[PDB]
């Protein structure tokens, strides 16, 4: 099972300037719960952006996707194609924008957090992938966060 998991502003923005333009602790706990124990696949840019302190993510098989054949991600497996990353019963693709779009055709689930920030799309932003008709989704109720922000969870599935 290949799933994607991401957190986006309502506008689709997931990233800017190499970082995240918000903080939502509840989303981090949700992300941890969904990925824990499983393989996680990230793009090289996302790996670089993480402080070495939080890297690799505990309890998960960390895989970094890079076009650099001898790239070394200390504490992670480096692979040159998504297919090499996709063993194990359950793999979660955890960003960023380029790798979500690459992985979506392989995916059967998307777990999406929507953050109610009015954040406009800007040139250069990382964006969430666009989900076609084949994605049936269940809207969660609007939760409320200790950061003061309103957010909502979507569980998308297909086939």
Ligand X SMILES: NC(=O)C1=CN([C@@H]2O[C@H](COP(=O)(O)OP(=O)(O)OC[C@H]3O[C@@H](n4cnc5c(N)ncnc54)[C@H](OP(=O)(O)O)[C@@H]3O)[C@@H](O)[C@H]2O)C=CC1
Ligand Y SMILES: COc1ccccc1-c1nc(N)nc(N)c1C#CC1CC1
**Which span (27-35, 71-79, 117-125, 138-146) binds ligand Y, by CB under 6 A?**
27-35
Q: What's the residue count for the chain?
A: 159
- Closest CB to ligand Y among residues 52, 69: 52
Cα(82)–Cα(102) distance, integer angstroms: 8
Per CB under 6 A, does 36 bind ligand Y? no
Angle at 83 between CA 75 and CA 87, to 5 degrees: 65
Q: Give whole-number Cα distances, 85 to 1, 90, 120, in Å.
A: 12, 11, 33
- Choosing among Co ion, ligand Y, a second copy, none, which partner's interface includes residue 72 (Cβ < 5 to 8 Å by kind)? none
For the chain, how big is the Rg over CA atoms in Å? 15
Least distance (Å) from a second copy to the CB of residue 44? Answer: 26
CA–CA distance, 1 with 14 (Å, rounded to integer): 23
Please give the Cα distance from 67 to 13 (Å, whole number).
Answer: 24
Please select the residue that binds ligand X; options are 39, 44, 85, 156, rule is CB under 6 A: 44
- Bridge-based pairing of strands 2-9 and 91-93 is parallel
Cβ 104 to ligand Y shortest distance, Å: 14
Which of 71, 154 has the CB closer to a second copy? 154
Instruction: Name the minimum Å distance from CB 113 to a second copy.
Output: 11
71 vs 154 by CB, closer to ligand X: 71
Over the window 66 to 85, marking each residue x when it contacts ligand Y by CB under 6 A and - when it does not, the resulting string is --------------------
If we measure between CA atoms, which residue out of 95, 93, 27 comes closest to residue 60?
A: 93
Among 94, 99, 107, 127, binds ligand Y (CB under 6 A): 94
Task: Based on the shown chain and the rule CB under 6 A, indicate whether residue 28 belongs to the binding site for ligand Y.
Answer: yes
């Amino acid at each position: 099972m290949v799933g994607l998991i991401w957190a986006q502003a309502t506008s689709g923005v997931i990233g800017r300037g190499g970082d995240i333009p918000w903080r939502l602790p509840e989303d981090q706990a949700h992300f941890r719960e969904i990925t824990m124990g499983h393989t996680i696949v990230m793009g090289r840019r996302t790996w670089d952006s993480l402080p070495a302190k939080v890297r690799p993510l505990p309890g998960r098989r960390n895989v970094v996707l890079s076009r650099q054949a001898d790239f070394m991600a200390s504490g992670a497996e480096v692979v040159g194609s998504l297919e090499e990353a996709l063993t194990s019963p359950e793999t979660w693709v955890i960003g960023g924008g380029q790798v979500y779009a690459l992985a979506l055709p392989y995916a059967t689930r998307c777990e999406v957090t929507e953050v109610d920030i009015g954040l406009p799309r800007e040139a250069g932003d990382a964006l969430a992938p666009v989900l076609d008709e084949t994605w049936r989704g269940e809207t969660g109720e609007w939760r409320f966060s200790r950061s003061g922000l309103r957010y909502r969870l979507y569980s998308y599935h297909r086939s």
